[PDB]
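agent> step 3/5: call structure_predict on target 'Dual specificity protein phosphatase 10' (Homo sapiens).
agent> reason: downstream docking stage needs a structural representation; sequence fetched in step 2, passing through unchanged.
tool.input:
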Amino acid sequence: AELTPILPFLFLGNEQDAQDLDTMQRLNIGYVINVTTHLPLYHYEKGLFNYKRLPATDSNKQNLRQYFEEAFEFIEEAHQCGKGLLIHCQAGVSRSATIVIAYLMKHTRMTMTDAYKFVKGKRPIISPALNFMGQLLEFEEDLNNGV
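tool.output (status=ok):
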């Protein structure tokens, strides 16, 4: 699957997209979120991008909610200086997709269902782990209650 534009400044990809320096520059991406503990920060040595690692493991029983606010601040940082941001994990199917869905629910005010449908329409391969789906559902509750 190709790199997925979500918003003009937000792109959802896999570990191969993170290696595509030509695409990254063409899309004015200046920021990179890596949602794994174990993948490299590709192109770090080139001194071109600002990076953020959210060190998610390979276990589906893990807590991703704890990374939401950190990721949100970084995305707003990129948006506020007029650059794009690439968020990726290994396949762009579960870990990175969950954070993107969470972002759309909080900062675009979409319901979980519409946020999921929005990303799924653009990136048909997404399929967040069921434990991640439950955390998003609790996040939706928290947003609706003002928490």
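agent> step 4/5: record observation. The beta strands are 4-7, 10-13, 29-34, 50-53, 84-88.
agent> proceeding.
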